Symmetry: C3
């Protein structure tokens, strides 16, 4: 890890003194879910590039910013654009924001992402609540906590079986009932793979066999660091596509489709997250 | 990745100006399959050591060369000796040749390798056509595309479900029928593991459960980079041994046997590849 | 690998000339199993910090020492405190001791560790004999042998199917019978995961499906290097806890419990190892 405790502190103190905003809930917007930033009131923007020690974006779209403000009663801080392992960032960089959020006073982390559907019941447009995750990179050594542990953040061996807040998931099923939607709020296990290339058929079959319902290349690391911090964690995935499971199919997974699905099912998530804010304690 | 686009370009331009040969098909010879180089006509050799930016071989046999020429009508370029992750090379080095081939004008990549049999039907000597692969290293982060993506080569999120050319596999089943062989042309999923040590029984059982038919420690990376390039991909494995699946057995997997199997079933592959060249378009 | 053959040699020669002790059996004490060092007679201690080229401990407890001496007839060398991948050490550092032991004249390696139970029959306190292992980090590239192979230590492609000495496991079942214990000596497959965070429910389910009986974040690397050396290998795990397999449970895996289980079932292992020494040849 190239960051010392002081680096986290310095980044927090800098932000704290550059905004009157004191966020309680940190929200990490997934792919095509950055619209959430529009609903924040008294929205103050910060380009990642101007924040000390922040991993400087590469060239996806060169748009990486932190937006503080209020979302339906809650003082938030939103990450529009997240860092992925496939871009070359080590996990201690990818999850650097999470630790900053913690020293800023945040106690809740909401993570969202786009994902391929492994569970055959899922349909494009669906919203899967994350009850658990399978951290494939972590089994091999790619765990954001690798390296010496700093007592100030958490313990050497944090548990993850209770990573996704039971309460918040129940309250989300409610908020969705109040939404009065045709499709029900899906729920399942999110498996993380590094990517960036998409899975082959044999691979989708493996991920299915392992018991995963959705697959993506992010989130798990932020969640582990969050939990290591003491943060309350709640999150969901937007099934942007059904991963190919047979060799007869003549369709391929593509960034085009994923962005399109994020485009249409857009505002639906935005409502759900905004309304969900009320369900979050303080 | 320690290579810039220019490095690939410089290596291509260098080769291009050191040979009148303009290959269309790149062939990566697996272990004990390097004999294929003998059939090339007007064969021009290049030691890896003399090619700019090429990963310099270590000490397997210190023999690593690029052979240009013609193989049954097709202008080829053969890699006799390939780079493996277990030797310490990062994947961006292992797959460096593939990108060079592309800038040289190659549009087809034929990859061959030796492998352990996971599918109990397979027998030593068998030839498994690769219909799909399971990229275990990739799930964890060891994917040759990790790091910033260069638009000039391909897209950020290339698909792999269609990685192994459907057409070429069918035409291979034909060419094998014309071969009039006792044993049929096997076909299945190749699982890549880093090695270098051989699998334990519990591990073979895992690889079996995942649905893999053959296991090796190469290929998948070259295939991913190839596909990322736009290359047509076709390849096969020579089952050099049946991986141990029970604890009663008193036999161990060894490099001795693998080389021996490659030695006898040698020329059989050489015919198949040479004849297969005619099946490859232009 | 940052170590040259000479570094191993220099460390061996240094130890050899700083102790009259010439160990035959190397013992790696797992978590809360370091008590084994108490039974050594004519016990000579060496802090890792004073041994040339030894990975210098971080801050777990700052206690990392090598203890030479005799354990029930056998000239031993015990590692009290082992190096783990999750601390940031690359595997060539983690397993550095093993190669030193070999050049010191050791021909047997006994490895012990604490582990979570995956097999539902296992109970806290149980002692699982290791018949085989699943090396998840290794499939991805995290194998201690990665990098050039030094002929002087072993071969490029060592086998692991016969890694855990058949004979010694049988003799251990005997020694346990002579122990006259209520519970029988368990036996099974140890799966290694990098950690440091504990598994989630979905993950435990995966490890179960793969056929693992116990899970930990060590051992496999030392075993692979040992086997690569020619060392006889025998080892066991102390089931310090039953990993959570259902979402209804309200208990979490914690370092507290693991240490406690190691605390009570302590001396039981110490007897077993001490008595087992007699079963080890020479
Ligand atoms: O089929 C899939 N496999 C793996 N990840 C995704 C995702 C998630 N994100 C979306 C994004 C690519 O379009 C990349 O960062 C991965 C959507 N569909 C799939
Ligand atoms: O049983 C096996 N397990 C994993 N790989 C192989 C291979 C493939 N190559 C062959 C070569 C070792 O002999 C090394 O580079 C791996 C053949 N048999 C097996
Ligand atoms: O449930 C478990 N999962 C993974 N490893 C362990 C272990 C083994 N060691 C014990 C130690 C943590 O308490 C750390 O180095 C891992 C005990 N229980 C479990």
């Amino acid at each position: 890890n190239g960051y010392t405790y002081e680096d986290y502190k310095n980044t927090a103190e800098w932000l704290l003194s550059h905004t009157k905003h004191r966020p309680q809930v940190a929200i990490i917007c997934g792919s095509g879910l950055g619209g959430l930033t529009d609903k924040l009131t008294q929205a103050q923007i910060f380009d990642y590039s101007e924040i000390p020690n922040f991993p400087r974006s590469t060239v996806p779209g060169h748009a990486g910013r932190l937006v503080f403000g209020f979302l339906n009663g809650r003082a938030c801080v939103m990450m529009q654009g997240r860092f992925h392992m496939y871009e070359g960032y080590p996990l201690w960089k990818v999850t650097f924001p999470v630790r900053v959020f913690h020293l800023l006073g945040v106690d809740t982390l909401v993570v969202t992402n786009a994902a391929g559907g492994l569970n055959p019941k899922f349909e494009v447009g669906d919203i899967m609540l994350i009850r658990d995750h399978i951290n494939l990179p972590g089994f091999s050594g790619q765990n954001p906590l690798r390296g010496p542990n700093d007592e100030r953040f958490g313990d050497r061996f944090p548990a993850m079986s209770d990573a996704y807040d039971r309460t918040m998931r129940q309250r989300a099923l409610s908020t969705w009932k109040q939404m009065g939607e045709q499709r029900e709020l899906q729920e399942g296990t999110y498996v993380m793979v590094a990517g960036p290339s998409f899975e082959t058929v044999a691979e989708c079959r493996v991920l299915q066999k392992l018991g995963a319902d959705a697959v993506g290349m992010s989130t798990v690391p932020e969640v582990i660091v969050a939990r290591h911090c003491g943060l309350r964690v709640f999150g969901f995935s937007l099934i942007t596509n059904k991963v190919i499971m047979d060799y007869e199919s003549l369709e391929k997974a593509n960034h085009e489709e994923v962005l399109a699905a994020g485009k249409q099912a857009a505002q639906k998530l935005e409502q759900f997250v905004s309304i969900l804010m009320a369900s979050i304690p303080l």
